[PDB]
């Protein structure tokens with residue numbers, strides 16, 4: 224939780240209306256340091272002291288994380304009004320819209336690199352005993368160099384069956400969600416289960432339906448999705464094994480067909 228003087232921040236265009244409030248693209252220029260682009264999150268106008276505390280508690284959590292695939296907190300504005308959370312700027316935005324706007328424009332190995340980065344950030348979060356519960360391509364952000372970073376600090380079709388049926392949220396239910404993300408990425412942002420209703424998805428999953436390989440998806444990558452979607456949460460790979468499998472695919476690209 225580093226305190227940033229608001230005079231070091233210039234707020235430019237709006238780039239989103241999140242749930243707590245608005246997000247802006249801005250510039251951060253600390254004395255003696257090179258200027259960087261940042262995302263500035265604001266709380267909706269008229270926020271209560273309780274909403275303020277809730278907001279700054281989110282910041283406190285983000286500040287604990289220091290990983291290349293986790294959104295970096297630059298600092299907070301709390302001495303002046305309104306409060307703000309300042310994070311690193313991700314030029315390409317949310318991963319799902321980024322893929323939908325660039326359909327077919329990335330190679331398989333670029334896509335696997337993106338998935339590897341996400342798995343590495345998720346490994347770090349799980350190692351620190353945090354369960355995301357909301358892992359989806361819409362909650363991953365992408366910088367100018369295609370590095371993907373986990374953000375967003377019940378979406379039924381992203382959620383593990385035990386998490387829906389028994390509210391048991393663990394890193395193993397995040398792994399289920401990660402398998403759905405893999406499918407979104409390899410499909411360039413298709414909707415999981417398409418137009419199936421939430422209950423249709425639940426019923427299908429209970430009858431051992433699983434999503435098919437996206438077009439031109441390597442068989443080995445779709446198999447790793449299916450491993451993530453094992454009914455028994457203990458049979459799923461942990462994020463450490465996912466990273467190692469994706470590394471081995473990257474290091475052995477013949478594995479990709």
Ligand SMILES: CN(C)[C@@H]1C(O)=C(C(N)=O)C(=O)[C@@]2(O)C(O)=C3C(=O)c4c(O)ccc(Cl)c4[C@@](C)(O)[C@H]3C[C@@H]12
Nearest residue numbers: 239246262264294310311312313314316317374375376
């Ligand atoms: C902390 N808060 C400001 C937002 C958030 O939830 C993040 C986080 N620390 O988990 C972000 O990554 C964000 O901090 C963050 O980095 C965002 C951001 O840079 C961005 C860019 O660059 C392009 C498109 C979009 Cl949609 C976004 C955008 C709206 O998702 C924001 C979100 C914020």
